[PDB]
Amino acid sequence: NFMLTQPHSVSESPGKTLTISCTGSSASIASHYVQWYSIDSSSNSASLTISGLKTEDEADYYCQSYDGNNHWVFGGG
Amino acid sequence: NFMLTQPHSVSESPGKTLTISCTGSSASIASHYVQWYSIDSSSNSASLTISGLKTEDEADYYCQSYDGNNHWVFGGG
Amino acid sequence: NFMLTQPHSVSESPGKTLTISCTGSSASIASHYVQWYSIDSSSNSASLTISGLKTEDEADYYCQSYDGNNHWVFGGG
Amino acid sequence: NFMLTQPHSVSESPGKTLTISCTGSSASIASHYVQWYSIDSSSNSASLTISGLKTEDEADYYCQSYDGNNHWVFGGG
Amino acid sequence: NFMLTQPHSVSESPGKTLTISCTGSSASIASHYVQWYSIDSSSNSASLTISGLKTEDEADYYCQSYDGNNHWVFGGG
């Protein structure tokens, strides 16, 4: 779901840069998650058959960020 | 869902730059999530058959950001 | 859903720049989420058949941002 | 749904610049979400058949932004 | 789900740079998670058959980040 590219970056940052939390779900079939460094690049999926699928899902994500100065702070349930 | 590209960036930022939280869901079939660094680039999916699908989903996402100075603060349920 | 490109950026910002939260949902079939750095670029999907689909979804997203100075603040349910 | 491009930007901003929250939903079939850095660019979808689809969805999005100075503030349900 | 590339980076950052927590789920079948350093690159999946699938999942993710100076702070359940 999340796609991020920075092919030419000059960056100056006094701070905690990449704070990454609570990503998600991937239910995949013959998927191609592809990354690399007459020309032919080829990622190929053929002719499949799927008959019957049933899924039931309950997803609960919790990310809490409490900063500065905190006192008797309650988070969550 | 989320697509972000910065191919030529000169950036100065005194702060916590990329704070990334609570991304989502990917239910995919023969999907191509593609990234790379006579020419032919090729990502190919063929001729499939799917008969019957049933899905039931409950998704609850929670991201809370409490900053500065906080006192007896309650979050969530 | 969210598409953001900055191919040539000169940016100065004293602040927390990219605060990204609560993205969404992707239910896809043979999808092409494509990013790269006689010419032919080619992303191809062929001739498929889908018979019967049934989906029931309940999505609840919660993002709360409480800043400055806060006291006995209640958020959520 | 959300498309944002800034190909040549000179920007000065003392503030938290991109605060992005509560994006949405993508239910797609053979979709092409395309981004890159005799010429031929080609993204192609062929001749498919879909017989019967039924979907029932309930989406509830909640984004709350409480700033400055707050006291006994209640948000949500 | 999470894809991040930085092919040419010059970065200066006095801070804890990559703080990565609470990633997710991958339920995959014949999937290709591909990374490398007349030309032909080829990742290939053939013509399979799947009859009947049933899955029921409950996922609860918890990431909490409490910083600065904290006193009697309660997190979680």
GROMACS .gro file of C-alpha atoms in nm:
model
  385
    1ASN     CA    1   0.000   0.000   0.000
    2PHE     CA    2   0.273   0.241   0.102
    3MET     CA    3   0.516   0.333  -0.177
    4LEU     CA    4   0.795   0.582  -0.117
    5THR     CA    5   1.091   0.660  -0.341
    6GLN     CA    6   1.367   0.920  -0.306
    7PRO     CA    7   1.614   0.859  -0.591
    8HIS     CA    8   1.825   1.175  -0.547
    9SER     CA    9   1.809   1.336  -0.206
   10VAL     CA   10   2.021   1.594  -0.027
   11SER     CA   11   1.867   1.626   0.316
   12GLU     CA   12   1.966   1.801   0.637
   13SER     CA   13   1.742   1.747   0.938
   14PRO     CA   14   1.821   1.782   1.308
   15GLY     CA   15   1.549   1.547   1.425
   16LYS     CA   16   1.439   1.187   1.445
   17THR     CA   17   1.368   1.146   1.077
   18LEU     CA   18   1.175   0.831   0.986
   19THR     CA   19   0.944   0.720   1.265
   20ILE     CA   20   0.738   0.443   1.108
   21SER     CA   21   0.466   0.254   1.292
   22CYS     CA   22   0.144   0.052   1.244
   23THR     CA   23   0.157  -0.069   0.888
   24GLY     CA   24  -0.099  -0.308   0.752
   25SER     CA   25  -0.217  -0.621   0.582
   26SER     CA   26  -0.127  -0.811   0.265
   27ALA     CA   27  -0.333  -1.111   0.156
   28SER     CA   28  -0.192  -1.195  -0.185
   29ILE     CA   29  -0.196  -1.469  -0.448
   30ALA     CA   30   0.089  -1.494  -0.703
   31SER     CA   31   0.184  -1.134  -0.630
   32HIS     CA   32   0.503  -0.966  -0.747
   33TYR     CA   33   0.663  -0.723  -0.501
   34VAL     CA   34   0.951  -0.623  -0.723
   35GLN     CA   35   1.258  -0.408  -0.660
   36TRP     CA   36   1.593  -0.394  -0.827
   37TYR     CA   37   1.901  -0.186  -0.894
   38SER     CA   38   1.748  -0.557  -2.673
   39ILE     CA   39   1.655  -0.533  -2.306
   40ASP     CA   40   1.363  -0.706  -2.136
   41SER     CA   41   1.253  -0.681  -1.775
   42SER     CA   42   0.980  -0.936  -1.706
   43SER     CA   43   0.761  -1.028  -1.414
   44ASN     CA   44   0.490  -1.267  -1.526
   45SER     CA   45   0.179  -1.438  -1.391
   46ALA     CA   46  -0.005  -1.706  -1.588
   47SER     CA   47  -0.368  -1.815  -1.626
   48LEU     CA   48  -0.496  -1.954  -1.297
   49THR     CA   49  -0.835  -2.067  -1.164
   50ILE     CA   50  -0.978  -2.001  -0.818
   51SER     CA   51  -1.309  -2.157  -0.718
   52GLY     CA   52  -1.435  -2.044  -0.379
   53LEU     CA   53  -1.296  -1.813  -0.114
   54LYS     CA   54  -1.436  -1.701   0.218
   55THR     CA   55  -1.258  -1.476   0.463
   56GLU     CA   56  -1.364  -1.299   0.781
   57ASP     CA   57  -1.121  -1.056   0.937
   58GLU     CA   58  -1.110  -0.824   1.238
   59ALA     CA   59  -0.816  -0.583   1.240
   60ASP     CA   60  -0.753  -0.334   1.520
   61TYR     CA   61  -0.447  -0.111   1.501
   62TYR     CA   62  -0.325   0.104   1.790
   63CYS     CA   63  -0.044   0.357   1.767
   64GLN     CA   64  -0.012   0.622   2.036
   65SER     CA   65   0.252   0.896   2.049
   66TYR     CA   66   0.272   1.091   2.375
   67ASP     CA   67   0.545   1.351   2.390
   68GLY     CA   68   0.679   1.651   2.577
   69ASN     CA   69   0.588   1.618   2.943
   70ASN     CA   70   0.308   1.392   3.057
   71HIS     CA   71   0.142   1.316   3.389
   72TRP     CA   72  -0.112   1.042   3.475
   73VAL     CA   73  -0.194   0.993   3.106
   74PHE     CA   74  -0.404   0.688   3.018
   75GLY     CA   75  -0.408   0.532   2.673
   76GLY     CA   76  -0.576   0.241   2.502
   77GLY     CA   77  -0.858   0.018   2.619
   78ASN     CA   78  -0.300   0.335  -0.188
   79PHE     CA   79  -0.031   0.577  -0.079
   80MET     CA   80   0.215   0.676  -0.352
   81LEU     CA   81   0.492   0.927  -0.283
   82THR     CA   82   0.791   1.010  -0.501
   83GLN     CA   83   1.062   1.273  -0.457
   84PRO     CA   84   1.315   1.219  -0.739
   85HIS     CA   85   1.522   1.536  -0.686
   86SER     CA   86   1.499   1.692  -0.344
   87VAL     CA   87   1.705   1.949  -0.158
   88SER     CA   88   1.545   1.974   0.183
   89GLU     CA   89   1.637   2.146   0.509
   90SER     CA   90   1.407   2.085   0.805
   91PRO     CA   91   1.480   2.116   1.176
   92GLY     CA   92   1.209   1.876   1.286
   93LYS     CA   93   1.103   1.515   1.298
   94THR     CA   94   1.038   1.479   0.928
   95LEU     CA   95   0.850   1.163   0.829
   96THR     CA   96   0.615   1.046   1.103
   97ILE     CA   97   0.415   0.769   0.938
   98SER     CA   98   0.142   0.575   1.115
   99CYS     CA   99  -0.177   0.370   1.059
  100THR     CA  100  -0.157   0.254   0.701
  101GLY     CA  101  -0.409   0.015   0.557
  102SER     CA  102  -0.520  -0.297   0.381
  103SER     CA  103  -0.423  -0.482   0.063
  104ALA     CA  104  -0.623  -0.782  -0.054
  105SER     CA  105  -0.476  -0.860  -0.393
  106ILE     CA  106  -0.473  -1.130  -0.660
  107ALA     CA  107  -0.183  -1.148  -0.911
  108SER     CA  108  -0.094  -0.789  -0.832
  109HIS     CA  109   0.226  -0.615  -0.940
  110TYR     CA  110   0.380  -0.374  -0.688
  111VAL     CA  111   0.670  -0.268  -0.903
  112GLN     CA  112   0.974  -0.051  -0.832
  113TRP     CA  113   1.311  -0.031  -0.993
  114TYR     CA  114   1.618   0.181  -1.052
  115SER     CA  115   1.499  -0.165  -2.838
  116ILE     CA  116   1.400  -0.147  -2.473
  117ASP     CA  117   1.107  -0.326  -2.310
  118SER     CA  118   0.991  -0.308  -1.951
  119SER     CA  119   0.719  -0.566  -1.891
  120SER     CA  120   0.496  -0.665  -1.603
  121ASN     CA  121   0.229  -0.905  -1.724
  122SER     CA  122  -0.082  -1.081  -1.597
  123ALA     CA  123  -0.259  -1.348  -1.800
  124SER     CA  124  -0.621  -1.460  -1.846
  125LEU     CA  125  -0.753  -1.605  -1.521
  126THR     CA  126  -1.093  -1.723  -1.396
  127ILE     CA  127  -1.243  -1.664  -1.052
  128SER     CA  128  -1.574  -1.825  -0.960
  129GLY     CA  129  -1.707  -1.718  -0.622
  130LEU     CA  130  -1.574  -1.490  -0.351
  131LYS     CA  131  -1.722  -1.384  -0.019
  132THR     CA  132  -1.550  -1.161   0.231
  133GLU     CA  133  -1.663  -0.989   0.550
  134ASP     CA  134  -1.426  -0.746   0.714
  135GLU     CA  135  -1.422  -0.519   1.018
  136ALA     CA  136  -1.131  -0.275   1.029
  137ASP     CA  137  -1.075  -0.029   1.314
  138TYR     CA  138  -0.771   0.197   1.303
  139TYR     CA  139  -0.656   0.409   1.597
  140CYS     CA  140  -0.378   0.666   1.582
  141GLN     CA  141  -0.353   0.927   1.856
  142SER     CA  142  -0.093   1.203   1.878
  143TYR     CA  143  -0.079   1.393   2.207
  144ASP     CA  144   0.190   1.656   2.231
  145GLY     CA  145   0.318   1.955   2.423
  146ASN     CA  146   0.222   1.915   2.788
  147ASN     CA  147  -0.059   1.685   2.893
  148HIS     CA  148  -0.229   1.602   3.221
  149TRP     CA  149  -0.482   1.324   3.299
  150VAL     CA  150  -0.557   1.280   2.928
  151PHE     CA  151  -0.762   0.974   2.832
  152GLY     CA  152  -0.759   0.823   2.485
  153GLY     CA  153  -0.921   0.534   2.307
  154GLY     CA  154  -1.203   0.306   2.416
  155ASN     CA  155  -0.586   0.695  -0.374
  156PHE     CA  156  -0.322   0.939  -0.256
  157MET     CA  157  -0.072   1.044  -0.523
  158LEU     CA  158   0.200   1.297  -0.446
  159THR     CA  159   0.501   1.388  -0.657
  160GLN     CA  160   0.769   1.652  -0.605
  161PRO     CA  161   1.027   1.606  -0.883
  162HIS     CA  162   1.230   1.925  -0.822
  163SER     CA  163   1.200   2.074  -0.477
  164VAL     CA  164   1.400   2.330  -0.283
  165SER     CA  165   1.234   2.348   0.055
  166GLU     CA  166   1.319   2.515   0.385
  167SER     CA  167   1.085   2.446   0.677
  168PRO     CA  168   1.152   2.471   1.050
  169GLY     CA  169   0.882   2.227   1.151
  170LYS     CA  170   0.779   1.864   1.155
  171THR     CA  171   0.721   1.834   0.783
  172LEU     CA  172   0.537   1.518   0.676
  173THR     CA  173   0.299   1.393   0.944
  174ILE     CA  174   0.105   1.118   0.771
  175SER     CA  175  -0.168   0.918   0.940
  176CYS     CA  176  -0.484   0.711   0.876
  177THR     CA  177  -0.457   0.600   0.516
  178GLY     CA  178  -0.704   0.361   0.364
  179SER     CA  179  -0.808   0.052   0.181
  180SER     CA  180  -0.705  -0.127  -0.139
  181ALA     CA  181  -0.900  -0.427  -0.264
  182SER     CA  182  -0.746  -0.497  -0.602
  183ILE     CA  183  -0.736  -0.763  -0.874
  184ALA     CA  184  -0.442  -0.773  -1.120
  185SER     CA  185  -0.358  -0.414  -1.033
  186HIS     CA  186  -0.038  -0.235  -1.133
  187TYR     CA  187   0.109   0.002  -0.874
  188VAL     CA  188   0.401   0.115  -1.083
  189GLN     CA  189   0.702   0.334  -1.003
  190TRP     CA  190   1.041   0.361  -1.159
  191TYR     CA  191   1.346   0.577  -1.209
  192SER     CA  192   1.260   0.260  -3.002
  193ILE     CA  193   1.155   0.271  -2.639
  194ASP     CA  194   0.861   0.087  -2.484
  195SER     CA  195   0.739   0.097  -2.127
  196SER     CA  196   0.470  -0.165  -2.075
  197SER     CA  197   0.242  -0.271  -1.793
  198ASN     CA  198  -0.019  -0.512  -1.922
  199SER     CA  199  -0.331  -0.693  -1.803
  200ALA     CA  200  -0.502  -0.959  -2.014
  201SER     CA  201  -0.861  -1.073  -2.068
  202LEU     CA  202  -0.997  -1.225  -1.747
  203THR     CA  203  -1.338  -1.350  -1.630
  204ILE     CA  204  -1.494  -1.298  -1.287
  205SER     CA  205  -1.824  -1.465  -1.203
  206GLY     CA  206  -1.964  -1.364  -0.865
  207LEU     CA  207  -1.838  -1.139  -0.589
  208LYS     CA  208  -1.992  -1.041  -0.257
  209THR     CA  209  -1.827  -0.820   0.000
  210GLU     CA  210  -1.947  -0.656   0.319
  211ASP     CA  211  -1.715  -0.413   0.491
  212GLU     CA  212  -1.718  -0.191   0.799
  213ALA     CA  213  -1.430   0.056   0.819
  214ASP     CA  214  -1.381   0.298   1.109
  215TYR     CA  215  -1.080   0.526   1.107
  216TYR     CA  216  -0.972   0.735   1.406
  217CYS     CA  217  -0.696   0.995   1.401
  218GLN     CA  218  -0.679   1.251   1.679
  219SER     CA  219  -0.422   1.530   1.710
  220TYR     CA  220  -0.416   1.714   2.042
  221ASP     CA  221  -0.150   1.979   2.075
  222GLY     CA  222  -0.028   2.276   2.275
  223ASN     CA  223  -0.130   2.230   2.637
  224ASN     CA  224  -0.409   1.994   2.733
  225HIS     CA  225  -0.584   1.904   3.058
  226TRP     CA  226  -0.835   1.622   3.126
  227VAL     CA  227  -0.903   1.584   2.754
  228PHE     CA  228  -1.104   1.277   2.649
  229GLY     CA  229  -1.093   1.133   2.299
  230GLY     CA  230  -1.249   0.844   2.114
  231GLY     CA  231  -1.530   0.612   2.214
  232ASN     CA  232  -0.889   1.026  -0.567
  233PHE     CA  233  -0.630   1.270  -0.440
  234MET     CA  234  -0.378   1.384  -0.700
  235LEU     CA  235  -0.110   1.639  -0.613
  236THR     CA  236   0.194   1.738  -0.817
  237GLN     CA  237   0.457   2.005  -0.755
  238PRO     CA  238   0.721   1.967  -1.029
  239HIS     CA  239   0.918   2.287  -0.958
  240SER     CA  240   0.879   2.430  -0.611
  241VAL     CA  241   1.071   2.685  -0.409
  242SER     CA  242   0.899   2.695  -0.074
  243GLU     CA  243   0.975   2.856   0.261
  244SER     CA  244   0.737   2.780   0.547
  245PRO     CA  245   0.796   2.799   0.921
  246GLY     CA  246   0.527   2.549   1.012
  247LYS     CA  247   0.430   2.185   1.008
  248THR     CA  248   0.379   2.161   0.635
  249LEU     CA  249   0.202   1.844   0.519
  250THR     CA  250  -0.039   1.712   0.780
  251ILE     CA  251  -0.226   1.437   0.598
  252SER     CA  252  -0.500   1.230   0.758
  253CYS     CA  253  -0.811   1.020   0.684
  254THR     CA  254  -0.776   0.917   0.323
  255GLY     CA  255  -1.016   0.677   0.162
  256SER     CA  256  -1.113   0.369  -0.028
  257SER     CA  257  -1.001   0.198  -0.349
  258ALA     CA  258  -1.189  -0.102  -0.484
  259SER     CA  259  -1.028  -0.164  -0.820
  260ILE     CA  260  -1.009  -0.425  -1.096
  261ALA     CA  261  -0.710  -0.427  -1.337
  262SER     CA  262  -0.633  -0.069  -1.242
  263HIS     CA  263  -0.314   0.116  -1.333
  264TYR     CA  264  -0.175   0.351  -1.066
  265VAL     CA  265   0.119   0.472  -1.268
  266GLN     CA  266   0.415   0.693  -1.178
  267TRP     CA  267   0.757   0.728  -1.326
  268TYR     CA  268   1.060   0.949  -1.367
  269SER     CA  269   1.013   0.663  -3.167
  270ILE     CA  270   0.901   0.666  -2.805
  271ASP     CA  271   0.606   0.475  -2.659
  272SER     CA  272   0.477   0.478  -2.304
  273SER     CA  273   0.211   0.211  -2.262
  274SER     CA  274  -0.020   0.096  -1.987
  275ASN     CA  275  -0.276  -0.145  -2.125
  276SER     CA  276  -0.587  -0.333  -2.016
  277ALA     CA  277  -0.751  -0.597  -2.234
  278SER     CA  278  -1.107  -0.716  -2.297
  279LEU     CA  279  -1.247  -0.875  -1.982
  280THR     CA  280  -1.588  -1.006  -1.874
  281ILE     CA  281  -1.751  -0.963  -1.533
  282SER     CA  282  -2.081  -1.135  -1.459
  283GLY     CA  283  -2.229  -1.043  -1.122
  284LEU     CA  284  -2.111  -0.821  -0.839
  285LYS     CA  285  -2.273  -0.731  -0.509
  286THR     CA  286  -2.116  -0.513  -0.245
  287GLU     CA  287  -2.244  -0.356   0.075
  288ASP     CA  288  -2.019  -0.113   0.256
  289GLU     CA  289  -2.031   0.103   0.568
  290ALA     CA  290  -1.747   0.354   0.597
  291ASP     CA  291  -1.707   0.591   0.893
  292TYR     CA  292  -1.409   0.823   0.900
  293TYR     CA  293  -1.310   1.028   1.205
  294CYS     CA  294  -1.037   1.291   1.210
  295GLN     CA  295  -1.029   1.543   1.493
  296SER     CA  296  -0.776   1.824   1.533
  297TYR     CA  297  -0.779   2.003   1.869
  298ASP     CA  298  -0.518   2.271   1.912
  299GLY     CA  299  -0.404   2.566   2.119
  300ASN     CA  300  -0.512   2.512   2.479
  301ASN     CA  301  -0.790   2.271   2.565
  302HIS     CA  302  -0.970   2.172   2.884
  303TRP     CA  303  -1.218   1.886   2.943
  304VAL     CA  304  -1.279   1.854   2.569
  305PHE     CA  305  -1.473   1.546   2.455
  306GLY     CA  306  -1.454   1.408   2.103
  307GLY     CA  307  -1.602   1.121   1.910
  308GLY     CA  308  -1.882   0.883   2.000
  309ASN     CA  309   0.295  -0.344   0.193
  310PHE     CA  310   0.574  -0.105   0.284
  311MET     CA  311   0.812  -0.022  -0.001
  312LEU     CA  312   1.096   0.224   0.050
  313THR     CA  313   1.389   0.293  -0.182
  314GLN     CA  314   1.668   0.549  -0.157
  315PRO     CA  315   1.909   0.480  -0.446
  316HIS     CA  316   2.126   0.794  -0.411
  317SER     CA  317   2.119   0.960  -0.073
  318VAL     CA  318   2.338   1.218   0.096
  319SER     CA  319   2.192   1.259   0.442
  320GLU     CA  320   2.300   1.438   0.758
  321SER     CA  321   2.081   1.393   1.065
  322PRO     CA  322   2.168   1.433   1.432
  323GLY     CA  323   1.895   1.204   1.559
  324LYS     CA  324   1.781   0.846   1.587
  325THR     CA  325   1.701   0.800   1.221
  326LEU     CA  326   1.502   0.486   1.140
  327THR     CA  327   1.274   0.384   1.425
  328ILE     CA  328   1.062   0.107   1.277
  329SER     CA  329   0.791  -0.074   1.470
  330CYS     CA  330   0.465  -0.272   1.433
  331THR     CA  331   0.469  -0.400   1.078
  332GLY     CA  332   0.206  -0.637   0.952
  333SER     CA  333   0.081  -0.951   0.791
  334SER     CA  334   0.161  -1.148   0.475
  335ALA     CA  335  -0.051  -1.447   0.375
  336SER     CA  336   0.081  -1.539   0.033
  337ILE     CA  337   0.068  -1.818  -0.224
  338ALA     CA  338   0.347  -1.851  -0.485
  339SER     CA  339   0.449  -1.492  -0.421
  340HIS     CA  340   0.768  -1.330  -0.546
  341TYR     CA  341   0.937  -1.086  -0.308
  342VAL     CA  342   1.222  -0.994  -0.537
  343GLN     CA  343   1.533  -0.783  -0.484
  344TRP     CA  344   1.864  -0.776  -0.658
  345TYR     CA  345   2.174  -0.574  -0.735
  346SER     CA  346   1.980  -0.975  -2.504
  347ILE     CA  347   1.895  -0.942  -2.136
  348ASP     CA  348   1.604  -1.108  -1.957
  349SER     CA  349   1.501  -1.075  -1.595
  350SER     CA  350   1.226  -1.324  -1.515
  351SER     CA  351   1.011  -1.408  -1.217
  352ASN     CA  352   0.735  -1.645  -1.320
  353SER     CA  353   0.424  -1.808  -1.176
  354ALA     CA  354   0.233  -2.077  -1.364
  355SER     CA  355  -0.133  -2.181  -1.393
  356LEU     CA  356  -0.256  -2.312  -1.058
  357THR     CA  357  -0.594  -2.418  -0.917
  358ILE     CA  358  -0.729  -2.344  -0.570
  359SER     CA  359  -1.060  -2.493  -0.460
  360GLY     CA  360  -1.178  -2.372  -0.121
  361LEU     CA  361  -1.030  -2.139   0.137
  362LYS     CA  362  -1.162  -2.018   0.470
  363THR     CA  363  -0.975  -1.792   0.707
  364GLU     CA  364  -1.073  -1.608   1.024
  365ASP     CA  365  -0.823  -1.366   1.171
  366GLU     CA  366  -0.802  -1.129   1.467
  367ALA     CA  367  -0.505  -0.892   1.459
  368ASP     CA  368  -0.432  -0.639   1.734
  369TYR     CA  369  -0.123  -0.422   1.704
  370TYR     CA  370   0.008  -0.203   1.987
  371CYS     CA  371   0.292   0.045   1.953
  372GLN     CA  372   0.333   0.314   2.217
  373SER     CA  373   0.601   0.584   2.220
  374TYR     CA  374   0.631   0.784   2.542
  375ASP     CA  375   0.908   1.040   2.547
  376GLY     CA  376   1.050   1.342   2.725
  377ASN     CA  377   0.967   1.317   3.094
  378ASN     CA  378   0.685   1.097   3.217
  379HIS     CA  379   0.525   1.029   3.554
  380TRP     CA  380   0.268   0.761   3.650
  381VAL     CA  381   0.179   0.707   3.284
  382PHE     CA  382  -0.038   0.404   3.205
  383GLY     CA  383  -0.051   0.241   2.863
  384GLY     CA  384  -0.227  -0.049   2.701
  385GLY     CA  385  -0.510  -0.266   2.828
   0.00000   0.00000   0.00000
